Amino acid sequence: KMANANKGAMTENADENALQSDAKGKLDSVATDYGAAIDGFIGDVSGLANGNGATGDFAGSNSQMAQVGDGDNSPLMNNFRQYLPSLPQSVECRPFVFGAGKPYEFSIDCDKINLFRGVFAFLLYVATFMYVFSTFANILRNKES
């Protein structure tokens, strides 16, 4: 059988289950690194956004995001509080006396000042409430709030 001799001369025993397994193993061992990198980027950006934190390339922005602050306490904003103008603290009403000790001595009875103080407080609330309501209603709109 010369056919058998020629076939044996130009033939190498190759197994599909070996070559396929090796190729798939290498491809998986590198695709796992690919997926790990993608998931790491996603986790870093999410942690920066929600305050959990970031590791790796984004670790340097942790200090900056902590300086920005969360909730309503912004350390970047609190710098302006040191220069905030000083304003008087509201106290009880004291009547003002004109010409004290003289025959023309009259004083503001301060009974109507309290009524004015009540209506002023009401107006200040209605203004602040409307401001906050419009502030929340126009968050997606690129407007000052």
């Binding site: 025959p103 023309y104 009259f106 503001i108 009875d109 109507k112 004015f116 209506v119 107006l123």
Partner: protein
């Protein structure tokens, strides 16, 4: 001399009139100032 006593009596009457007028004008001016200040403060507030 009755004239001197009469002048003194008229002076005393004028003084008591001045006292009553001062009381009334103080009341009136106090009320006016109170009303004016209330109106001004409310107008500025709103």
């Amino acid at each position: 001399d009755p004239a001197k006593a009469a002048f003194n009596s008229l002076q005393a009457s004028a003084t008591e009139y001045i006292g009553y007028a001062w009381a009334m004008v103080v009341v009136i001016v106090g009320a006016t100032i109170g009303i004016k200040l209330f109106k001004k403060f409310t107008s500025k507030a709103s």
